[model samples]
Target: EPKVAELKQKIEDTLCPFGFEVYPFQVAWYNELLPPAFHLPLPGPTLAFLVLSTPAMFDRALKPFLQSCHLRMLTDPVDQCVAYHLGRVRESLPELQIEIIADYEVHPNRRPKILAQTAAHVAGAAYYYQRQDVEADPWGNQRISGVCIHPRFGGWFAIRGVVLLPGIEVPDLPPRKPHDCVPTRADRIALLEGFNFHWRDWTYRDAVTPQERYSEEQKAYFSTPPAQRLALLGLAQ
Candidate 1:
C-alpha cells in the first residue's frame, strides 16, 4: 500500500543517513506466539516496524550524544536519544505503540524474572533474522549466539527500537547485504574462550578501520590494571 511505502520512506529518509535501517514486520506471522494484548479482544500493537542501528549509527550519531551526556554526568544518553526519536512517531500517530530496548526489564537481580513476557521482547528482529534465513546454529543445541548477527552489520549493530502500529500491509524486507562473517565453530569457540573474538573475527565484519578502533579500545581497557577495571565495573576489589 502507498501508506506503507510512504511510512517506510519517511522513516528511511529521516534515519538512514544516521545509519539506521528499518524493517516492517507483519504481526500475523507471530499471532500464535504473541500475548493477549497483541491478539484480538484488546487493542495493542499489531504490526511492528523494527529499527536497527549500525556501528556507524552509534559512532556517528549516538556517540556524540553519549559523550555530551558524560560531560554533564548524565546517564543513559543512548537510550534517551533512542526514546527521543521513537517517541516522536508515537506522538504523531496515536494509534501506534512504541517499544524501545529500555522498556523491557532484563533478568532481574541476575536471575530470570518473567520468562513469558521476555520472549517477545525482541520478536521483531528475531522474526526478521529467521525470515532472512541467516544461519542459526553455532554449535551443540545452541544455534546462534546470544548476540544476533546480521549480514552487513555483523553483531556490531543493535535493534534500537520497534514501532508497533495497527496492522499495515508492508513489503518483504530485503536481507542485509551479504558479508563473509557468518560465525563458524572456531568463531563460536573463540568467543566462548575470551573477549578478543568480539573485535577480531566475530563482529569485525571484515572492516579494517572499525577493527583498528576496537583494538585500540581493547588495548586501553586492558592497559588499565585489572583492579581498576573491576572497580570501574562496580565489582568489589
Candidate 2:
C-alpha cells in the first residue's frame, strides 16, 4: 500500500501544478458497463483512473496555445494541449498505458470511450450527467446527461483527459451519497444571459481581443458557484 500511496502523491504533485486531479476507482466498478463506442477489453486489474480538468487547465495550461492558434494553427487547441502534456506524463511513467480521451475523431483502434468510462466510474462521479458530456459529447455520445452534477466546478469544468495507471491500487475512498446539483430554469437562463453573439461568434477580423471577448462578468459566470445548489433541467435521456 505504501507504494500505491507514494505513487498517488507523486501523481497529484505532478498534476496539481497544471491543474489536474486524479480519482482512483475500484476495478470492480469498471465491470458495471462497457463503452458502446468500442470493443476493447476492459483494462486489467491494478489500473486507477486519472481525471484531468479545472478552470486553470484552460486559463493557465491551454490558453497560451490559443494565442498562437493562427501560427502553427492547432485546429483543435484543447486536443493538442491535452495530448502534449499527457504525452509528457506518459513519458515519465513508461509502465503506464496512458489512454487519452479522443477529442476529434474516434478511430476503432483508439479506445478513447472505454478509457473515459473507466475513469469516470472509478472517480465516483456520474459518467454522463454533466454539462461537459452533454454539450461536448467528448466521447461521441457514448453516454447520456442527467441531473447528477459535480459538487465543486459545476458545469464549467471538463474531463479533458483520462489515463490508465496500471499497477496502481485504487484509493480507499468513502462511498458518497447519491445527489444532484441541478440548476433551476431561472439559473440556466441567468447563466445564458451573460453571453452574447459577439462573444460566442467573434472573428479574428474583429478589433476585439480574446481577453475582451469574455467580460469580467462572463468569466465570473463560469467561476465556482456559491454554497447554494442550483436546480437541474432533468435527465437528458
Candidate 3:
C-alpha cells in the first residue's frame, strides 16, 4: 500500500489542505483489496501529470536548441499506454516531482467546466516553467489538451478535445537555456504528460451510496439530486 499511501499524502499536501476537494471515490479504490483488479495499475495521476506537463519542460530544457518547432499533444490512440510506461522512469529519478488528478478527483459539479479549463492551466504552467529556464525560447510554449487511454476498458473512457492556455506569459525568465538542465517536479510532470494506465485504483469505500436496504417511500423520492442518483445507480463510475 506504499504507492497508495504515498499518493494520498501527495494529494493532501499539495491539493487537499488548500481546500481543493478530492472525490470520495479516490479513497474507496485505493483502500480496496489488491485483487479483483481488472486493470493492473490505473495510471490516472501519473499519466495525467505527464500528458499535461511534457512540452513545457521540453521547451524550457531545450530553449536555446529548439528550432521554430512547436510542441503539440499527440493522442495516445491507445489510452495513454505510453505515459504509463514512462512512469517507470520515475523509479530511477527519485528526485522528480509528479502530481496526477484522476477524473474521479474532479468534483462532480465542476468536472465539465474544469475539464474545459485544463488547457489554460497547462499553458499557464508552461509559461511559468519556461520563465524559470534561462535558456528557453519563450515562443515555444503552447496550450495542449489532455488525452485519456483506458487500458482495460477503452470504451469507458472519455477523450477531451484540444486545450489551449490563453493570455499568459512570465516576464521574469531570461531568454536562454542552461547547459546543465535542472528539472523541477512540475517539469517532470509535464515531460510525461501523455502516458497512462487506467485502473481507478483509489476509489473510496463509502462513496455515498444512498441505500443499504430500501424503503418504499425512500424509493419514491424521485426528485433526488442527479449526482446522488448517479451515485446510487453506480453511474458515478
Candidate 4:
C-alpha cells in the first residue's frame, strides 16, 4: 500500500527535474478503458505510470542531452533522453520487473503495442479529446484522429510513454478523472477540425490556450525531417 506512493514519488522525483511528469495508474484502470485487444496482460492490480514531456523538456532535457553526446542520428534524441532517464529508474529498483513502452513501439503485425492516448487518458495525465467527443460533427463519416490535452499545458505536451512495474500491486488507489479543458460542443468541434485538417499549423494545439507551447527552436526541430534533425541541432558529424 505505502509502496505505491513511495515508488511513484521516486519515479516522479527522478523525471520531474528533466521537465517530465509521471502519473501512476493501476493496470485494471487502463484495461477497463480499452478493449480486449488493447488490454495490458499484467494482473489487474499491477502498477504503471504514464510519462509526459512538457515544453520545458526541449531546453531542460534535450539540449543538455545533446551536450553530453547522447544526441545522435540513429534515433530521435528525445526518445534517447527519455529512455536514458527512465532506464535509471528501472536500474535503481533492480528487484522489480520493469517494462518501458515507447509511444512508437509496435508489434510484428504493425499494431501499436500500446495506445498512448488511451493510456494518458486512463492515467489522468491528459484529457483524450477525440472526434467522437464532438456531437454532430461536420465530417460526415470522414475519419479524424483524437488528441490529448493537458489541463495545465493544454495541447503543448506530448505523451512520451508508459513504465510498467509488473511485480508491484496496489489493490487500492484513489481514482481521479482527467480535467476537461474543452467543455463546449462548439469548441470541441473546432478543436477536432483544427487537429484533423490543419494539424501541421498547430491550430488544434491552440484550441484551448496553452500555458506554455513549444519554443521556436523546438518547433524548428520538429518541423524538420528526422534524417536532418541532427544537422539542425548542429551535431552533424
Candidate 5:
C-alpha cells in the first residue's frame, strides 16, 4: 500500500504543477474490458497510471512549452507538450521501469496501442457513458459512441495516455468505479447527439457544467484543424 501511494504521490507532485492529473489502475482492470487483442501484455496487478490534461494545461503546460521553443513538421502542439512532460516524469522516476504511451500512438497497422477512454474509465478518472449505459435512444440504428466526463471538468478534459510500470505489482489496489456525473438518460442522449451530430458546435461539452473550462484561446486552438493550428501560434507563419 505504501509503495503504490509513494509512486502515485511522486507522479502527482511532478504533474500537478503542470495542470495534469494521473490515476492509478491495474493493467488487468483495463484488460478485462477489452478482448485479447487489445489487452496489455502486463500482468493484471501490474500498476499503470492514466494521464489527463485539464483545461489549465493549456496555459500552464502547453503554452509555456510553445513559448519556450521548437516544434516543427506537423505535430499537434499539445501532443508535443504532453510528451515532453511525460519525459520529465520518466526522468524523475529512473529507479522504476516506466513506459509512456501517448494517446495518439498507433500500431503499424493503425490500431491504437491503448484505448484512452477505456483506460480513463478503468482508472476511475472519469465516467465513460456509452450506448449500453443508456437504453432506447432516440436515434434509431445509428451508432452512439462513449465519452468520458471528468467529475469536475465535464468533457473539457483530455486523456493524454497511460504510463505502464512493468513488473511493479499493486495487488491490493482497489479499482474505484468511475464517478457517474451525467446520470440521466436524457442528458446522456443529449451528450451523444451533440458529440455525434453536432460536434463542431461544442454542445456536447456543455452537457454538464464544469468547474472550469478551456480558455477562449484554448478552445479556439482546438477548433482549428491540426494543420492550421501551427500558423495560429505563429510557428508556421
Candidate 6:
C-alpha cells in the first residue's frame, strides 16, 4: 500500500509535462493495489483492465504515469494492435518494460461513434489503442484516461488522452499549461502521428542480448512462444 500511496504522490508531480487534466478516482483502495507476481488476472475479456504489471506504470511515489503508457482500454482489436506494437518495442529494448491496456470492441455497430468520441477526448496525453474488430463487451464507460479504437483492418489506433492525477488537491507535482490537460489542436494530432510512426519502427531485438540480434521480421516471428502460435504477427502484408 505504501508503494501505491507513494506512486500517487509522484503522479501528482510529473503528470503535467505530457498534457492532462487531473481527476481523482475519488476512491481509495482498501485492499492490495496489485495482485502478487504470480497472480496475473485470468485471461478473459474485460470492459477494462489495468496494466499494473508493468514497472513503468508505477513510480516510487504516489501518482501514476498519467500519460506514459501507449495503450488503454477501449476495444479488443485495438488491444491486439497494442500487443503487436508492444512486442516490437520489446524487441528494440528487451531490457525495458512497456505497459499498455485494451478493451475488445464487442458491439461493432457502435464502434464508429465510440472512435469518434475517443478522437474528441484523447489527444496529446495518451497513446490510442484502436485495433481490429473482435467480439467483446458492447459498450463501456471509460474514465480511465486513454482509449483504443478499431480501425479499418486488423490495425488499431492508440490515442494519447488527458492526464488526470497530478493536480488532485495534492502537492508534489510539476505545473503544466492549462490547455495541456485535455489535448487540443497540435498536441492531439501529434500523438496520433507519433503512434503511427512508432508502429512502423520498433522490434524486440534486445531479447537475444547485445551480441545476438534478430532481424525485425525474425524478431516478430519469434517474440511469442510456440504455445501461442495464433498470436503471431508481422508487418501487414
What lDDT tens digits, residue by residue, belong to model 4 across residues 37-148?
9989999988889999999998998889977866666677778888787787788677788899988789999999889998898788898998879777778867888989
| Highest-scoring model, lDDT | 5
TM-score of model 3 (CA atoms): 0.19
lDDT of each: 0.46, 0.47, 0.27, 0.84, 0.88, 0.27
The list of candidate 2 runs beyond 4 A from truth reads: 35-44, 66-74, 95-105, 108-112, 115-118, 125-148, 167-237
TM accuracy, model 6: 0.22
The digit string of per-residue lDDT tens for model 1 on 78-112 reads 55556656665565555544443323325546532
* TM-score: model 4 vs. ground truth: 0.92
lDDT accuracy of residue 159 in candidate 5: 95
C-alpha lDDT of candidate 3 relative to the true structure? 0.27
How many angstroms is residue 161 displaced in model 3 relative to the true structure, after the best TM-score fit? 12
Tens-digit lDDT track for model 3 on 1-237?
344345435533443221222111221122132333222133322212212222122222223222323322342111132223233333423454533332223455554322312222232211222232333423246543322212221112122222111121222322221122224544323322322222222121111221221223322332344433334445545
Which pairs of residues collide in model 2?
182-230, 182-231, 182-232, 183-231, 183-232, 184-231
RMSD of 1: 7.3
Pairs clashing in candidate 4? Answer: none
Which structure is stronger by lDDT: 1 or 3? 1
1 or 5, greater by lDDT: 5
87 in model 6: Cα distance from truth in Å?
24
Residue 125, model 3: Cα distance from true site in angstroms: 11
Using TM-score as the yardstick, the better of models 1 and 6 is: 1
- Model 4 has how many clashing residue pairs? 0
lDDT digits (tens) for residues 104-214 of candidate 2 = 336577534544634454466533333342342333534322322245554334565555564554445443332334335443222332222223332211221122233
CA lDDT of 187 in candidate 5?
A: 89
Please give each candidate's TM-score.
Answer: 0.53, 0.56, 0.19, 0.92, 0.94, 0.22
